[PDB]
Amino acid sequence: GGMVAMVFASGSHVFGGIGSIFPLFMMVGIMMMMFRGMGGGQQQMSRPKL
């Protein structure tokens, strides 16, 4: 968010409209890795073994 805010304060206004799709997709992809992700050996019942 700081990168986008820094660019907006600087005045580039490149992310307005469809340009915003880059920050949006990235922020979603980061969400998938940190919240769901996959467990280690402590979570033995990973879908392919169960």
Partner: protein
């Protein structure tokens, strides 16, 4: 009229040797360990999108 023939003590026959053999137990198929393939696939996209 026939020629005489006296049978001597029998000659030693070649000795037979038995053998007790226990077979090698077969190998066991390795159980299916599995990589979290999708995680690294999202990873290379996020670093690329940056």
């Amino acid at each position: 009229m026939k020629r005489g023939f006296a049978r001597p003590t029998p000659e030693k026959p070649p000795v037979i040797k038995p053998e007790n053999i226990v077979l090698s137990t077969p190998l066991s198929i390795p159980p299916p360990e599995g990589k979290p393939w999708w995680l690294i696939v999202v990873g290379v996209v996020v670093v690329g999108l940056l």
